[PDB]
Amino acid sequence: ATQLQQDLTGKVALVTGAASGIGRDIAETYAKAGAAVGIADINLEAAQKTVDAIEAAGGRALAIAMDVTSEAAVNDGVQRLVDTFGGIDILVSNAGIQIIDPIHKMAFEDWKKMLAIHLDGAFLTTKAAIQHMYKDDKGGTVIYMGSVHSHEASLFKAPYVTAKHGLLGLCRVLAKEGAVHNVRSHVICPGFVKTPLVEKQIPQVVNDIMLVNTVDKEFTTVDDIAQLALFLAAFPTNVFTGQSIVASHGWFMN
Amino acid sequence: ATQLQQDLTGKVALVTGAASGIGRDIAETYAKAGAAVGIADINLEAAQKTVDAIEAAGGRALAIAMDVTSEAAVNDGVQRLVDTFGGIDILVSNAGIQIIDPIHKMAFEDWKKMLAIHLDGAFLTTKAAIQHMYKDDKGGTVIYMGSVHSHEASLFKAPYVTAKHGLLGLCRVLAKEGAVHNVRSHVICPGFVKTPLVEKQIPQQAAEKGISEESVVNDIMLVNTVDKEFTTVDDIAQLALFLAAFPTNVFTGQSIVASHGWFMN
Amino acid sequence: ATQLQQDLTGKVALVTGAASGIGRDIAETYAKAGAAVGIADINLEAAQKTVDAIEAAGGRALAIAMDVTSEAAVNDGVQRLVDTFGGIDILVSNAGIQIIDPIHKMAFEDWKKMLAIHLDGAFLTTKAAIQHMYKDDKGGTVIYMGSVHSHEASLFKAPYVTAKHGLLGLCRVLAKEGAVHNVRSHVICPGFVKTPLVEKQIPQQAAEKGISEESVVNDIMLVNTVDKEFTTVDDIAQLALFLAAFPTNVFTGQSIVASHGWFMN
Amino acid sequence: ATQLQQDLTGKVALVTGAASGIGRDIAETYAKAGAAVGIADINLEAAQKTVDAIEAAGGRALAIAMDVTSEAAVNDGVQRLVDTFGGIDILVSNAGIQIIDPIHKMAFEDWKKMLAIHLDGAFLTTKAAIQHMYKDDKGGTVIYMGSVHSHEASLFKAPYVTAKHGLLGLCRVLAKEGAVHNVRSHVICPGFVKTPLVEKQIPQVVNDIMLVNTVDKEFTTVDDIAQLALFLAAFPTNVFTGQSIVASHGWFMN
Ligand SMILES: NC(=O)c1ccc[n+]([C@@H]2O[C@H](COP(=O)([O-])OP(=O)(O)OC[C@H]3O[C@@H](n4cnc5c(N)ncnc54)[C@H](O)[C@@H]3O)[C@@H](O)[C@H]2O)c1
Ligand SMILES: NC(=O)c1ccc[n+]([C@@H]2O[C@H](COP(=O)([O-])OP(=O)(O)OC[C@H]3O[C@@H](n4cnc5c(N)ncnc54)[C@H](O)[C@@H]3O)[C@@H](O)[C@H]2O)c1
Ligand SMILES: NC(=O)c1ccc[n+]([C@@H]2O[C@H](COP(=O)([O-])OP(=O)(O)OC[C@H]3O[C@@H](n4cnc5c(N)ncnc54)[C@H](O)[C@@H]3O)[C@@H](O)[C@H]2O)c1
Ligand SMILES: NC(=O)c1ccc[n+]([C@@H]2O[C@H](COP(=O)([O-])OP(=O)(O)OC[C@H]3O[C@@H](n4cnc5c(N)ncnc54)[C@H](O)[C@@H]3O)[C@@H](O)[C@H]2O)c1
């Protein structure tokens, strides 16, 4: 007989985009599970508010100014975490934005900004993290925040769908490369969640366009994603390495 | 901030194939979490041994003689569980066998036996279970035991690969039909696990091919893992408990591959 | 610089379900390309009508009474084609029916009938065909008629979706086993095609739901196409001829979806 | 009864990376089928040699200097084609390179160069092409050159696998957006082909690493890919819009 593992005591996690939404719930969930957590965001003030809440709730956290499009900012922020907490056991590459336009109208600047945040961010944070994890084959976990848009398309989201599909590719290479150093990789693929990234979109409908391909017309929640991220991060074996897991109430059945 | 849910207190589960291997660990893990478990298997005596181990640890279980190929045996055993513990919240359709032969040699009766156990067993237990779960839209969880062989093929396993592919289809239909009744469906897709279904295969293939058992394991069975590791019964029982206990229906219709990087879904 | 190959001169094809719909067009298209075609279907008279149209256009065909659920009927009909035209180069396993009911209402005998036609029919015709194709490693092409329902689910179609998922598995195993004998396998996955199997469904679902036939077509059947278009029998016959005539085994084990953007594979 | 369609008489195609390998066979195949073909390459001299061969073989072609990473070079080259032949009916986005390194060793410059060629090239050529195709809903075909690495990973190819996965995403969005203007999109996914991109790799093995996941230990050929590209380009209906088709001798069964 067995039981679920969820203790991250002694572990150090870095979550990008951790000032808000899904990242913030993953960070606070990891801190409640006993991890020391780096709150990495381009918004340093918002990151420090998250850290203050985590510390008041009895956890350990560090606010890290990090534009994930910048090699220097990624390398310096990972080093700050390692200097502060002694290492890095978990990376969640979660920072993201949305920019909506049809391909024939979309600015090339907006295309490149989307790939810079979603794909360059994923590459830079992965490379920095695994350089530490590969030391003495101690290993670690890398989770990418994908989407149902890793697996299928929607109108007017060309660069987002391109990026979220690409994150599967990066995850699958890291599973192969990382195996020899005890590094496992996963992609979590949510459906729509009522974060600021989405409550933004609703004004600029729920049952008829956004939840139309769910089986039950339910939003995915931040706690759905944070529970799956804790289950993966705490998992005692590398059995899930290379996998994507869709959390979408039946929108794309993987 | 949140945390994992793993409490099945007050829940009733039926696990087919629970005398052995993956099903036995899922049943014992569900009982440890507070579920009452129906142990459904071909022989009452073999099922009763799993019941004995659950009762020794302070859990509640019932041995159910159920050949999942039989409509009457499936209907009668599901009714016995409901009559005993008051309902059914969780079905795990897990009973299986392996018959190995290339298509051009495979006996038609072996093809039919394989689809009956894997596919008719999944239909019959599903239909009997959701009759109860659909009542007053109480709802429940149906888990199918698929495989990496739900998603790709291996030599000499046509009916097995056909069946494990088919179970994704049944799960996807049940996700759509069950939603209005609070029924969620899932497929767990293990890589090789060293149950008796596999431990039998190792000496056999070593002798046929005239290679070491190490070669069978490393160059044939685990050749497409990234790390040359078997999946374990505890891997699959932890995933089954994570899904059975999950507080929302967010995973309904999904397959999750637990294979050490053999087919990256 | 290259060009398409579409010459089947000197080839012998067997198409199951070729009295009607998708199978009839594939058979007539293969004959036009110079193949001799076995028209296999439940009734000799219905199959003979397809043979009549092929002969009128200057082609060679044979009506074969074959219930693909029967091992003896399948073995006897494959032998008749081989005895008549000297061999079998191409199998298209296409015979099918649709039975619509939600899982909780579906008769077990309807589940079993569906898997027998789609899955036992695919095993039996495959095994009988490759006995011949494996001789002297002459080789050949096996095409399964899958569906979008090979890859995703719809309400009330559990056995159909289970079967069409299963055919991907059988195709993937045959790709691995057949390679050493120059046998290649493929699954064609159409969206909705207005054959009699579908034209029957439109009035029926309009009457049950109390909606227009336009609504059945646009809001139910084609709702997940990008352009609200049916797939056609000529779409599927052109893909079948492209695959049957292809000069290399480059597509072996693949499924190709022909669905106007309904499931993008 | 029906038959295969392969006549491109009256049609205008643009193939990127058309000076060499798969692109060159697609271009010459389209020209033999009666299309006027733009031979778009960063190597203008190599492009003009391809054009000379096509013209001597009795076809129509135009050499177009085009770095697909450059918005200006893409827009100017598409306009040159349209000015010369009267429009654009077919785009094959095929230009590519390979850069091999593990994630922990890979230069960030090499990551960005790979995404610039594979993904920015695809975006820029698509946007330019569909602006013409969308005029009076005349429509057209866009084919991306993916890979088995659209669908699964190999060691030491993080940016390539990321890019080829991303091309599925872009194709699936264009199928949805393009449908209202009679534009269809496809991805062709070859396994290994003995082009210069690969005969390069063999020195720097065949049966045991490169063809190990094929069912028959065969290379994919340039004519395999060119036949599939002609079959799609000539297809009388939009039935295959949004689809990827794997041509790999059983390496990844889609
Ligand atoms: N909300 C949804 O429906 C949904 C669904 C599936 C996937 N996603 C993905 O989840 C992730 C998080 O999205 P969210 O909904 O929580 O959004 P959010 O806007 O609530 O949070 C995103 C965070 O990323 C930060 N950020 C933005 N650009 C950054 C940069 N260059 N460097 C560092 N930090 C940066 C923002 O400041 C913010 O704190 C994204 O990758 C998104 O694509 C969201
Ligand atoms: N072991 C593996 O590597 C592996 C990997 C992937 C999937 N699976 C699947 O896991 C499931 C469990 O297999 P396992 O490895 O634990 O094997 P196992 O042999 O240890 O257990 C299977 C159980 O099923 C029972 N069973 C067989 N036919 C039955 C029938 N008609 N009615 C009722 N019970 C029946 C057996 O008696 C046995 O107790 C099967 O569906 C199998 O295909 C196994
Ligand atoms: N029409 C669609 O929209 C569609 C879409 C995807 C897949 N399909 C598949 O295409 C195939 C052909 O269907 P269709 O639409 O042309 O239908 P159809 O009814 O026009 O033709 C099916 C043929 O199969 C024959 N058949 C049925 N049971 C048989 C058996 N036991 N033995 C031998 N022959 C038998 C029928 O007599 C008939 O001639 C089926 O496998 C179906 O599932 C159809
Ligand atoms: N060869 C294979 O095994 C294989 C397999 C699958 C996919 N692919 C893909 O097929 C496509 C063609 O590859 P190939 O093997 O024919 O390679 P190749 O090297 O033979 O041809 C590539 C061509 O692209 C051109 N090119 C490079 N950078 C460019 C740029 N910035 N702008 C414009 N043109 C540029 C080169 O000059 C060359 O003429 C690529 O996208 C590749 O990823 C190749």
Ligand SMILES: CCC(=O)CC(=O)O
């Ligand atoms: C990917 C689902 C999500 O991130 C909402 C959106 O599509 O903008």
Ligand SMILES: CCC(=O)CC(=O)O
């Ligand atoms: C998928 C089931 C397994 O790992 C054992 C088998 O293939 O016989």
Ligand SMILES: CCC(=O)CC(=O)O
């Ligand atoms: C997939 C077969 C089809 O389009 C008709 C049906 O679903 O009944």
Ligand SMILES: CCC(=O)CC(=O)O
């Ligand atoms: C994608 C297959 C190919 O392009 C060869 C390679 O992996 O470099």
